[PDB]
Amino acid sequence: WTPPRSPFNLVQETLFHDPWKLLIATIFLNRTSGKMAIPVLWKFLEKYPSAEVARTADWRDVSELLKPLGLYDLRAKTIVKFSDEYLTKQWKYPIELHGIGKYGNDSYRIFCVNEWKQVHPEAHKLNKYHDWLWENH
DNA sequence: CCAGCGGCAGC
DNA sequence: GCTGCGCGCTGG
Secondary structure (H helix, E strand, O other), X not given: OOOOOOXXXXXXXXXXXXXXXXXXXXXXXXXXXXXXXXXXXXXXXXXXXXXHHHHOOOHXXXXXXXXXXXXXXXXXXXXXXXXXXXXXXXXXXXXXXXXXXXXXXHHHHHHOOOOXXXXXXXXXXXXXXXXXXXXXX
């Protein structure tokens, strides 16, 4: 499954290949604008390129990178814990993992797996993409 | 100046 | 269903 590129340019469209990177991206977009979050995401992924590296990280260093975005301490710790469960838990859907709710899970089911038709998103940009996929079907 | 808006866990 | 986290942002 390859999610097609849309006129909306969701960051999920480029990160679908690595579910961990796609899910980290949804964490960055939790109550934070893409214009603000996305530049910082590329810096985080430079310092922490995988779940293996991120799970062994000190949350205070992650928090320092998130500081300009807000929700910097809560998400720094969430990132470390999610990355640990991502690797240790037997999960089929990422909603099973700490820090991933409906929005990250709907993102995973539309971009990482071919399950877009069974998904009912309730997040603006995600809805624009999903509605577009139902249209250009 | 100042108030409201944009995920998720844990209660 | 309620709260808290936390900044930038927009509106007047």
